[PDB]
Symmetry: C4
Subunit: 228 residues, 4 copies
């Protein structure tokens, strides 16, 4: 209609989204203050009301957006994110997990999707990921196989670190980040299993060498984009 | 013959290797569950049978592959790997080391050699290695010489870390990864040998500087490949 | 006038700034010795006088520079820095914070602004920063949102690390540097909150992946400068 | 003469240096065994004799080399290194420091100078250094200025880490490597000086950011070499 076009030109208004962005940074500050228990004694009700004010506004104005765009809205990854972020924010407290209330803070990520400069940089990062998928596949296979080996080789006498497949996953990722791999994992390990370095020195080497290539690769593919 | 060509067109069948790949991921999951002792009480016999089912299949079908290809098979590094991986998997339990049973998990790496996308990424990594061989030679020489020096300079009062050439190798590699080099090695060292930094600050610097070049080099040689 | 031009050709003299540079390295050494309490017992008065000698000289000769250049001086970032560095150096001891006396050492950074080769390398580094501003914005938003989440999720039972928004900021930056993230933060955390890895493994991953891109980006933009 | 040319064509003989290289790896192994006290009880005299055999040979054959080349020898950095390495190896035990005997192991680095492939890779690394000299100057100035500040700000209550200019240098380098910067330096520091992060978070940032550029720079200058 021209009703649909009236709503649409309010919805795609620059001011409309600048008001939204403004609502985001305001509520962002809000949530910064609600970590403080001092501030929460004084203005607990103030901030808890503002939070509801803004979330209804977001639901009001995602209703409007869906009107304007219908199917195309749900095929847009930025819009989808604002949907599922305001969704998890909608569910009320004391229903399901209580952890859902920390997830309310995800609303702030609307800033990324509402700002164009932020949307540009995110798309640039996400762009890189497809080229990485082979290396990620390889590395996951490598982690999985060594997790099993380490679980089997060390999980009985070292149950906190290797007693479980998932425990070995975590410990192995720790090692890969190089965080206390020697004086916190392998040197203790070796106190019982003196040849444990035979398992972990190669693990280090391979994991490192692969990550280097992961990065080198990303660089090359960015230069191949400039050279066209 | 045309028998040889009949076997060969079953062996090079797409479906044939898709069945193999499928057998790999199945058994991969299997081995994930056999880390669990719960699952092993219930279905111990089930998984231990599946494992034998699949390994015979792999030996059956490496026999077929060798038939089809004979000498050319044993000059292919992917095929060779499947040979020596199914080989170490063949030897029965309680013969030789018992560690051979964790090595059975290496079978999962067949995924890398059976999948073409995985084979591509591995070849890409292995490609990089030849250019690195000079730097690796240098660094090994450097490690060896400092290992000796550190063994001699510190192995008596610090026998757990430097008492042996191999111990100093391990400790020096630890340092290179920067893992607790100061508050776990050098600062304790210095409690007795106050000028120990004179040995380790340069060691750090050289090792770091070389590794940077190792990487920078890899990058350049990848760009020299794009620029042709 | 030609008075103004007489002062100006003394002020822009090569020798003039070589004398200044010389005054900087001398006083640099001075301040190296005044860390020593031995040296301060013997020559305390000597160095404390030299320091005043030189600072008056610097104020004398920033007066001259402002004469020669007036407004253009205050629109130059190198000159501005020498202004505010000699300014904070001017304020006398025991007025305001006492920390202002360590800030006197900032005078040595005049070397960067007085030497041309040093000025070149600093401008090269500062040049890089504008391209980084999107990624920095993103990362700050990401840090802020996870700081809040971590403050809320863990600040009661872990008040030293997550009890405050700013405490969580510091702890999260620690994690990003990978410094004791597992055996000093997450593994203790998990002793009470077993699913804490669900918060921190992703945090690691995202922070790392972004930093890689931060760097990769810098590289590309430097090559885009060579290719013109 | 043609005597000089007779000696010269023995000295520049391929076999001559292959014999030398062979002497190096032999003695390299020797010195590996002399770390072992077992081996030193049995063959102490054997290895200690071999060591003298080879060093005289090296002095014999650096005499020959100097004959062949005279001044040009002493303007070659590879030859110079073999001079000063065999020199420090010449001085006998129990004269001066005893540390001179560990320096005997430096002889093994003759491998780098005697092998051409090794000489190539070393020259490639050393090549990189000139471009780095500005950044190194800057960073040294930065380290020095913060060392002083940290010595003054923290050396009284933290004398093991900051009580001395050189102590602060070491601690600051530790921080730069990120080794236990938080749970081993700054968090303890903060127990007394709660605003200590104001000094160290910026220090981290600047040091990191500079090192990135140090590396990025090296990459660019290597590509500028390929693009000619
Ligand atoms: C479009 C441009 C937007 C520009 C925004 C830039 C934002 C950059 C991040 C700013 C970080 C703020 C500094 C900070 O984290 O402060 C730490 C303090 C210390 O804790 P504090 O609560 O004082 O503890 C005292 C004891 N207590 C609880 C009993 C009162 O904790 C507090 O006191 C709470 C202070 C909350 C300040 C929140 C400021 C953030 C601005 C909004 C961020 C953008 C939202 C999308
Ligand atoms: C953009 C494309 C994708 C990006 C890359 C990420 C994809 C790969 C991620 C790993 C996939 C597998 C996930 C997995 O195995 O998780 C299982 C475990 C189960 O945890 P659980 O046993 O409940 O907890 C263990 C800790 N505990 C008991 C001491 C409290 O959960 C853990 O606790 C382990 C934590 C995960 C370790 C990280 C493994 C990384 C795999 C290699 C990735 C290379 C990155 C380049
Ligand atoms: C071609 C596409 C293939 C796609 C596959 C992608 C695979 C990515 C890695 C997946 C990682 C699986 C998650 C994981 O590690 O779980 C940790 C759990 C926790 O230990 P759990 O055994 O529950 O401990 C409970 C106590 N207990 C032992 C008495 C029962 O440990 C377990 O409960 C055992 C769970 C085993 C799950 C195995 C799933 C891996 C899929 C196959 C991998 C490919 C093989 C080549
Ligand atoms: C793709 C081309 C090749 C890839 C690069 C790898 C080649 C170089 C690897 C090192 C070669 C030398 C191997 C070696 O020296 O190993 C001897 C020692 C003997 O161990 P052992 O004395 O039985 O155990 C010591 C630990 N303990 C007693 C406290 C339980 O074994 C150890 O425990 C030491 C562990 C090895 C330390 C790593 C040394 C790296 C050398 C520099 C490589 C630079 C990489 C870019
Ligand atoms: C344009 C070209 C300029 C070239 C300059 C290159 C500068 C490079 C950095 C040099 C670093 C100097 C070495 C250093 O940090 O020495 C540590 C010593 C050890 O502490 P020390 O004070 O001996 O402790 C003994 C006990 N005590 C206090 C009771 C006496 O601490 C001391 O004894 C104090 C020694 C102060 C030496 C200062 C030398 C720096 C030169 C000026 C730097 C340039 C200024 C812009
Ligand atoms: C050239 C363009 C800009 C360069 C990038 C830098 C800009 C971003 C810096 C962070 C901005 C926000 C600053 C902020 O939130 O500071 C608040 C807190 C308040 O400290 P406070 O609560 O007084 O002290 C906590 C420690 N305590 C209690 C145990 C003694 O202060 C702290 O103690 C936290 C220390 C800061 C943590 C670093 C956060 C980094 C944000 C992400 C930056 C990514 C870098 C690529
Ligand atoms: C041109 C091509 C040259 C190719 C050479 C490649 C060299 C690569 C590095 C090889 C590293 C050798 C492995 C290693 O570090 O072994 C650690 C062992 C363990 O200590 P060990 O002495 O067995 O301790 C037992 C207790 N004890 C002392 C009472 C007997 O310590 C020992 O038992 C001593 C073993 C010494 C073996 C030395 C082998 C190095 C070859 C020469 C290196 C080139 C010299 C330039
Ligand atoms: C290829 C071109 C050149 C390569 C770059 C290297 C040039 C710069 C190196 C540093 C120059 C200044 C040297 C210096 O200040 O050393 C003084 C101190 C004095 O040590 P001292 O007070 O006897 O021992 C302290 C430890 N203690 C008491 C607890 C046992 O000695 C130490 O103990 C401190 C150890 C040195 C810390 C490293 C400082 C690095 C400066 C920034 C370099 C950036 C690298 C990219
Ligand atoms: C575009 C990008 C790479 C191709 C490209 O042109 N970019 C980089 C190549 C140069 C992406 C797009 C499609 C990707 C693969 C497939 O989805 C599945 C594949 C099977 C593995 O088991 C698991 C994931 C694998 C490795 C994926 C990674 C691979 O990387 C591909 C080709
Ligand atoms: C191809 C690659 C480098 C040449 C190239 O074109 N790529 C990079 C050069 C640019 C590879 C192929 C052959 C390699 C060397 C030799 O096998 C032996 C040699 C002697 C050392 O003691 C130990 C290994 C050394 C340093 C090897 C490394 C070197 O790197 C070479 C040339
Ligand atoms: C060649 C290289 C850089 C020039 C170049 O072409 N390469 C990189 C430039 C792009 C080298 C060669 C000569 C170098 C400088 C001088 O010796 C002294 C100078 C004064 C500082 O107080 C201390 C060292 C400085 C910064 C040196 C670093 C600088 O980096 C130069 C120019
Ligand atoms: C790139 C290729 C991949 C390389 C991967 C190869 C990994 C090599 C594995 C080396 C493992 C070293 O770890 C090794 O673990 C076994 C566990 O059975 C120990 O074995 C020891 O403990 C077990 C209990 O678990 C006892 O039953 C056994 O009698 C005893 O010797 C070894 O003493 C230890 O040194
Ligand atoms: C890039 C070039 C390569 C640089 C490599 C040069 C390495 C320099 C070596 C510095 C070593 C410092 O380590 C130094 O070790 C010797 C060991 O003899 C110590 O010496 C001390 O211990 C030994 C026992 O072992 C005693 O016999 C001796 O009387 C005592 O002084 C020094 O107090 C310590 O400071
Ligand atoms: C890229 C996407 C971003 C991913 C970010 C998602 C973060 C996921 C959060 C996982 C957090 C895990 O941390 C989780 O913290 C909560 C705190 O309520 C704990 O919950 C526990 O402690 C709290 C007290 O604080 C009790 O009230 C509660 O009954 C108890 O279960 C969980 O046992 C712990 O595992
Ligand atoms: C990029 C720009 C460079 C940024 C560099 C700026 C560095 C900023 C310095 C912040 C230092 C924080 O460290 C600060 O040290 C002083 C030391 O006087 C402490 O001060 C405290 O200790 C001293 C003793 O030494 C007492 O005399 C004083 O009364 C007390 O307040 C502060 O409580 C602490 O927080
Ligand atoms: Ca660490």
């Amino acid at each position: 209609g021209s009703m649909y076009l009236r709503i649409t030109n309010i919805v795609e208004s620059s001011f409309f989204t600048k008001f939204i962005i403004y609502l985001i940074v305001l509520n962002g500050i809000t949530m910064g203050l609600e970590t403080s228990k001092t501030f929460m004694q004084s203005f607990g009700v103030y901030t808890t009301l503002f939070n509801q004010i803004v979330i209804t506004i977001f639901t009001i104005e995602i209703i409007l957006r869906i009107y304007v765009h219908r199917i195309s809205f749900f095929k847009d990854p930025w819009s989808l994110f604002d949907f599922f972020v305001v969704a998890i924010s909608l569910v009320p407290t004391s229903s399901g997990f209580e952890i859902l209330r920390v997830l309310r803070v995800l609303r702030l990520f609307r800033l990324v999707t509402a700002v164009p400069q932020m949307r540009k940089i995110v798309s640039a990062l996400i762009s890189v990921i497809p080229g990485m998928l082979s290396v990620i596949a390889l590395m996951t296979l490598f982690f999985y196989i060594f997790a099993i080996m380490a679980t089997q080789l060390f999980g009985e006498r070292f149950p906190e670190w290797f007693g479980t497949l998932g425990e070995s996953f975590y410990t192995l990722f720790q090692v890969m980040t190089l965080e206390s791999w020697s004086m916190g994992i392998v040197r203790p390990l070796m106190e019982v299993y003196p040849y444990a370095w035979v398992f972990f020195i190669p693990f280090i080497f391979v994991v490192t060498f692969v990550m280097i290539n992961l990065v080198v690769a990303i660089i090359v593919d960015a230069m191949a984009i400039l050279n066209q």
